[PDB]
Write a protein that binds this ligand. Sequence first.
Ligand code: HEC
Ligand code: HEC
Ligand code: HEC
Ligand code: HEC
Ligand code: HEC
Ligand code: HEC
Ligand code: HEC
Ligand code: HEC
Ligand code: HEC
Ligand code: HEC
Ligand code: HEC
Ligand code: HEC
Ligand code: HEC
Ligand code: HEC
Ligand SMILES: O=S([O-])[O-]
Ligand SMILES: O=S([O-])[O-]
Ligand SMILES: O=S([O-])[O-]
Ligand SMILES: O=S([O-])[O-]
Ligand SMILES: O=S([O-])[O-]
Ligand SMILES: O=S([O-])[O-]
Ligand SMILES: O=S([O-])[O-]
Ligand SMILES: [Ca+2]
Ligand SMILES: [Ca+2]
Lengths: 102, 519, 519, 105
Amino acid sequence: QALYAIDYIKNYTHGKIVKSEYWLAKMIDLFPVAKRAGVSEDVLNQARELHYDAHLYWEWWTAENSVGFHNPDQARESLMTSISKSKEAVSLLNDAIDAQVA
Amino acid sequence: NLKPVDAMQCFDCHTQIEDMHTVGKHATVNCVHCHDATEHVETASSRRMGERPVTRMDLEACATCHTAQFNSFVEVRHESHPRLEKATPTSRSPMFDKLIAGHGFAFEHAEPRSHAFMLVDHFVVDRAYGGRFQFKNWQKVTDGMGAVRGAWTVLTDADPESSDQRRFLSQTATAANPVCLNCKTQDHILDWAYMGDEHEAAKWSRTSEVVEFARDLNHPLNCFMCHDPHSAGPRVVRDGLINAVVDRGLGTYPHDPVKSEQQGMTKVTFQRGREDFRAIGLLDTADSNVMCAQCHVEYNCNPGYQLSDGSRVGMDDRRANHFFWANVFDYKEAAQEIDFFDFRHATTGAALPKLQHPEAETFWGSVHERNGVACADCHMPKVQLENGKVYTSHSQRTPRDMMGQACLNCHAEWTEDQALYAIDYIKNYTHGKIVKSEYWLAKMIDLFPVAKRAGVSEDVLNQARELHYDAHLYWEWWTAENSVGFHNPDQARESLMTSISKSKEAVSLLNDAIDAQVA
Amino acid sequence: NLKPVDAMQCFDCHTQIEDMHTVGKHATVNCVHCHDATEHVETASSRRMGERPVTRMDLEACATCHTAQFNSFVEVRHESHPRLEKATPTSRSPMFDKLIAGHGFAFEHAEPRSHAFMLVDHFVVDRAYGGRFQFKNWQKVTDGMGAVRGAWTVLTDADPESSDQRRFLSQTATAANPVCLNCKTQDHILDWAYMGDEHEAAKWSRTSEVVEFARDLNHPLNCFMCHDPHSAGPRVVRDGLINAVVDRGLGTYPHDPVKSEQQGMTKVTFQRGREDFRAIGLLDTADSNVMCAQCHVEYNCNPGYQLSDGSRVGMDDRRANHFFWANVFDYKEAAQEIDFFDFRHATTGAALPKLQHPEAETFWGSVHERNGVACADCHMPKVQLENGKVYTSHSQRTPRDMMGQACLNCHAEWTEDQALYAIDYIKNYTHGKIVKSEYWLAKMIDLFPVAKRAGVSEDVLNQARELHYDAHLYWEWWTAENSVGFHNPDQARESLMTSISKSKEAVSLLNDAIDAQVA
Amino acid sequence: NLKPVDAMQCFDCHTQIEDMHTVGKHATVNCVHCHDATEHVETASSRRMGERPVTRMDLEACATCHTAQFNSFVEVRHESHPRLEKATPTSRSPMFDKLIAGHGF
Ligand code: HEC
Ligand code: HEC
Ligand code: HEC
Ligand code: HEC
Ligand code: HEC
Ligand code: HEC
Ligand code: HEC
Ligand code: HEC
Ligand code: HEC
Ligand code: HEC
Ligand code: HEC
Ligand code: HEC
Ligand code: HEC
Ligand code: HEC
Ligand SMILES: O=S([O-])[O-]
Ligand SMILES: O=S([O-])[O-]
Ligand SMILES: O=S([O-])[O-]
Ligand SMILES: O=S([O-])[O-]
Ligand SMILES: O=S([O-])[O-]
Ligand SMILES: O=S([O-])[O-]
Ligand SMILES: O=S([O-])[O-]
Ligand SMILES: [Ca+2]
Ligand SMILES: [Ca+2]
């Protein structure tokens, strides 16, 4: 039972780490597309400021060795923040790329 | 200590109960085991209920005389890893987030775990109630017996003062609606009209505030979902299943008219104010294929859209509670017949179906189903005892835990390791084709933004969107279905090859169109 | 399928059953579960039985609603070695044949095995029925479930045409009599008057032909031996126990009047033809010490002789069914009170007692008993489940199989190995003193022929025979008692040292007398 | 907490201890680990003990620096059956009582 409790936390936290990485990667891959579409430096810098937070609130948890066990609520809140920041950056870059196309 | 009541008094007004109770194996089981009807009897007339009697829906109402079945049911399989997200490289759908983008399952979709937890897991998953409900703490995730005693003994509500569906944490969704609960509990069996239609006698319906409904529900998988409490005979209670089998006349085995007749269902209707209210389906035989199909099917239990005009189909529409009762190769026709799709893909814009755990529809026509094997033979076999009264195990779990009873009694030519090897051959092969299907779907999906920004025509994009529907259907069936192909390995193979073919067709269409824009 | 009967009509005549059934936890359990009384009800008056109703005594009557308890009971402990003779160097009593010579146990006395087998083992042991009864073949010795279904489903009778006790093989005895069966079954509970006295309404009594009685008996350790079927409350049914505790006013705990009052017994009597016929003892609490003491006691269940004049005491005498209800140090006085001994030693000629399994009387005053521990705590513990409804294990067996529940919940300071080591320290020490007691008894016994042949006086031989009674009592208690000292290690030690002291005194007496004859 | 004593002073009288202690692998192990000699040193001469010093004989005196050896020593072998009489048919000497008669064993 105690092992099962550990695994519930680690499995849940790892799922959110993987989703955080999915969204960070989606954001990262838009940078070359935005650059080559002629998106402004102003927009790219806005996305870079979001990257700082998206990265911090993800990497803390791949760096930290307990896969959330040491503080499961904090891991959850942080990883949801990472995903939110990446999603904000994805929407910013997608809109800017689309405006360049139109 | 219980004191028996005179059932003859009740039978004067309750003739259907009389006909069931006096004939079956509960003829000697007094009503007081499950009902407190003292004030009811004092106030009722032949057509008016008067004071509402109390009916027990707790599983302990059955555990008093059937401890063995209850204990086997409530056991927690700790090897069934809990809260394990499927959208990870080590689980069922490594590219799920890209493929499902636009759907609420992107917020969380874990592997199933033991039946004791079904209602609490429904309440706490990130896609359901915006994170409103949590276990009281992270220790409680282990407590199967507590969950069975009641969800609200182990859960907390972030805001008991409001009843609206809303996000309490950012990366959650509010997909839950009242239809979901029919596959988690039947505590509401006397408070919900057939199909969840509006009804004067129903407290709850498809259009209820789901947070309020949630608070009224406690027990998972009540014992009476498969066993009539009055006759003790085999039954189903799930409205969607009765509607498919009986109302739409599709039969218990839609591909086999003979087996449908031998192993059929009889709809029994109960009234309120002499108006039809609720129904059950009595089974000809104790057929676990049909019992388990109350939940282990592909369904609608959600709002969606029409394929014809794209208009919203809300919870108020009957289509929001629907059993398709169709195998993978008949599913598209079944969705077209009700003019329905689930979501638009966030990247491709394609109208797509959302598939869920179609074990029953997958099992049809398989070698085991054709040879008269049923879910319970592999997942809740009879116990083998050197000296003891045999009973049926109710711990519904993988046969890997009980291979002697689940497989080897039939397969005498095999050792346990050989039978496990045969399972793994099928699962490994099927999973390889799922991963390849996802690779090709993802390759197609990633071409949509490239095509859009290259100026590819809407005509071409819509052609690719129509292919996306099929590529998705013929893939997602198999990540949704829990056997990783074991239940029907040839069908999985044919379907997944179809998925790959459709994606490849779309990739070639989009690549050519992008290239023509460049030249 | 059972159809319920009108219990209220029965209660018009059966007022004691009414008072028990309507109040207890079987108030909702219809009489048809255990009685077929249709013709009885048609023909009875309050003063005449009319047609005799059928009463079910099979354990399956209870297993329908209490499968967990039934299955735990019927389980066979294969580690309890079967048909293992105690008179061997590797068992409990290496010198038993020399010491017991003249008694029927010299023909066979095996170690106990699982409760499922008690009636069949009683029927087939070489000392009981002259070898008349056998298992149908040697494979049937494994079949606990079959024995529980009924003895005559697994046994054969060498001569169904005769009913006399006789030898069918040379080295057998015919020690069985009707009193024995009271500790193997209660199938005869409605056919046997209290104590087995003659009664117009009793088919069977102490003086019946035991072979005929045997053929009418089927089930071992009926569930109702400890649980009243009407109230579901705790009870005993064994006449000899009720006689000791209630009739003779000894109390449930003869050494503790306070515990006797708190944990007492109430005698309830049933009549036939308005004369007392049978009785039960309702317990104040669910006290396994007293439930198990229905059988695990020292008793008379046999003819014997008077200490006063040596005259025969036959089965017709009340003393042939007797619970001494006395510890080892009170037993000689208890036997003097009824003027009784069992056999004359074949070699020494001494009047001797025969002791059997005095677990209950040994447990009194021990550290565990004084601390309120009871047999069930160590031998029938509650089951421990991660998730499940708790019930009481009915697999009455050594705590070595379930040390976590039997010992270590109380003894938190110990590991399993430490607790086992503590058991073994006691058993090893006690067994060593048993072996030394047998060495000295055997030395004394062997001097009797030497003394007789040397012309030693009858006066000296009689003084030695008096010592033999004590040397025997204070040894045999401990080969008869099954815990090898664990139940009361200080008492075992004191007693076995007394045995050795007595034997040494007799050896000295005889050696001196022989030496004086030679001089 | 132990406070070391001046071993050189002890050696002014205890020459055999000096020759043993200063040469071996306990040359750095202070006498206070095993002796309480405060009043002894105050009252002794080379020819009179004075107050008797306390000497520790408990095994914990060594276990402080040699826990591994101490723990391996104190372990109980539960498989070495306890209080098992040798004069039984299943032990070492089945006829021991007859053969040893007259002896305390
Ligand atoms: C006629 C005077 C009645 C007697 C006697 C009993 N009941 Fe009844 N009951 C009656 C009516 C008219 C209704 C409304 C439904 C209908 O058939 O028209 C009911 C309802 C119930 C229910 C359902 C309660 C709910 O929550 O929906 C139960 C469980 C019930 N009744 C049980 C019951 C029992 C156990 C009785 C004997 C003690 C009994 N009823 C007497 C009418 C009458
Ligand atoms: C004791 C008072 C009972 C309560 C409460 C419940 N059941 Fe029962 N059940 C009971 C008996 C005596 C029997 C007959 C046993 C036999 O084999 O003859 C039954 C039977 C069932 C069966 C088997 C029915 C069949 O094979 O036709 C089922 C599936 C069953 N019972 C289920 C059940 C459920 C789900 C209960 C809670 C709602 C329940 N029983 C209560 C005794 C008692
Ligand atoms: C005593 C010194 C403890 C040790 C060692 C461990 N745990 Fe613990 N745990 C302890 C307390 C007092 C609490 C809070 C209890 C309460 O109900 O208030 C906990 C909590 C947990 C939880 C829940 C955490 C949450 O965030 O809600 C889990 C899953 C848990 N403990 C598990 C656990 C495991 C697996 C341990 C060994 C690695 C462990 N705990 C050590 C007390 C102590
Ligand atoms: C019966 C037709 C069902 C309806 C309606 C709903 N669910 Fe379900 N659910 C069902 C089964 C048979 C299973 C187990 C098999 C599987 O593939 O998982 C489930 C599982 C869940 C789980 C646990 C796994 C997970 O996805 O995290 C949750 C959290 C869950 N279901 C939630 C849920 C919600 C929110 C529903 C309404 C939108 C819903 N379910 C409907 C059967 C059925
Ligand atoms: C459907 C998913 C089921 C639920 C929920 C419950 N049971 Fe069940 N039960 C099920 C099957 C398929 C069978 C075997 C039918 C066959 O003949 O093959 C059973 C059997 C019973 C029985 C009969 C005795 C036995 O075979 O063990 C009893 C008494 C019974 N089940 C009780 C029971 C209880 C108490 C439940 C809730 C804990 C329960 N069942 C749930 C299918 C289903
Ligand atoms: C034996 C011939 C089977 C029959 C009949 C059914 N299923 Fe099955 N199932 C089977 C296997 C070998 C597996 C894989 C198990 C493994 O450990 O690899 C499965 C899997 C499931 C699962 C997922 C179980 C898990 O992963 O823990 C579910 C939910 C499941 N099966 C349900 C199910 C239903 C509802 C059936 C009747 C329609 C059914 N199975 C039949 C073997 C067999
Ligand atoms: C009065 C008209 C009676 C009614 C109604 C019932 N019984 Fe009876 N019973 C009656 C008598 C006079 C006797 C003889 C014993 C006595 O008390 O004098 C009995 C006996 C029984 C027995 C014991 C049978 C035996 O083997 O000794 C049983 C088990 C019994 N009765 C059960 C019973 C039941 C279940 C009834 C309702 C269906 C019932 N009896 C009605 C008098 C009367
Ligand atoms: C189902 C129709 C039953 C049959 C046949 C038997 N018993 Fe029973 N028993 C039954 C119920 C519903 C209950 C109450 C359960 C509760 O906890 O509320 C009982 C209870 C018992 C008990 C416990 C009594 C107590 O006071 O704690 C015992 C010891 C018991 N039952 C024994 C028993 C025996 C020996 C039976 C065969 C003669 C038997 N029961 C039949 C349901 C049923
Ligand atoms: C209750 C007071 C009893 C009476 C009367 C009889 N027996 Fe018994 N027997 C009893 C117990 C508690 C045990 C188990 C503990 C033990 O020391 O063995 C037994 C055991 C047997 C056995 C099996 C062991 C053996 O000796 O081979 C047999 C064959 C047996 N008993 C036969 C028997 C006969 C023939 C009796 C009447 C002369 C007799 N028993 C009476 C409890 C009681
Ligand atoms: C098949 C080639 C067999 C092998 C190998 C073994 N046994 Fe057997 N056994 C066999 C038969 C056909 C019979 C007679 C069956 C009948 O019901 O008539 C038996 C009998 C036994 C018995 C009963 C002996 C008796 O005298 O009544 C026992 C205890 C038995 N067998 C055990 C047994 C064991 C332990 C074996 C492996 C060493 C074994 N048998 C081999 C068929 C065959
Ligand atoms: C005396 C030797 C017993 C016999 C024979 C049977 N049971 Fe029993 N039972 C016994 C004890 C000491 C207890 C526990 C009492 C306590 O409260 O500590 C029990 C308990 C039961 C119960 C209650 C539920 C539980 O605790 O498990 C039931 C339903 C019960 N026993 C049933 C039962 C049946 C069916 C038997 C025949 C197979 C049976 N018991 C025999 C003592 C004795
Ligand atoms: C725990 C404190 C105990 C209580 C209370 C009772 N007994 Fe016991 N018993 C106990 C032990 C440790 C042993 C030796 C088991 C071993 O494997 O070494 C015993 C032994 C028995 C036996 C013989 C069992 C066997 O050898 O398989 C019997 C028949 C027995 N005990 C009966 C018994 C009765 C009737 C009790 C209440 C009066 C009783 N025991 C109390 C531990 C405990
Ligand atoms: C001369 C002035 C001494 C000094 C400085 C110390 N000790 Fe001594 N010790 C002395 C004498 C004359 C004796 C009597 C034995 C003898 O050799 O004639 C002792 C005895 C001891 C003993 C043994 C005590 C016993 O129980 O027999 C010990 C352990 C001892 N002494 C230790 C000791 C230590 C540790 C000193 C330095 C702190 C020390 N002694 C000083 C004479 C003198
Ligand atoms: C710490 C303050 C120590 C106390 C108290 C004891 N001993 Fe010791 N011992 C100590 C050291 C630092 C060493 C040298 C380790 C090395 O390998 O360099 C030792 C050595 C031993 C040895 C080995 C001697 C050899 O020649 O190989 C033994 C056998 C030994 N020690 C035993 C021992 C005993 C029995 C003690 C209690 C009377 C004891 N030591 C105390 C450090 C310390
Ligand atoms: O018997 S029911 O239909 O009231
Ligand atoms: O959401 S449920 O269908 O798995
Ligand atoms: O109720 S009984 O005593 O007939
Ligand atoms: O009360 S009786 O004697 O009919
Ligand atoms: O013979 S019985 O008492 O062991
Ligand atoms: O050094 S010792 O001999 O005093
Ligand atoms: O050397 S001593 O005698 O002081
Ligand atoms: Ca769906
Ligand atoms: Ca006796």
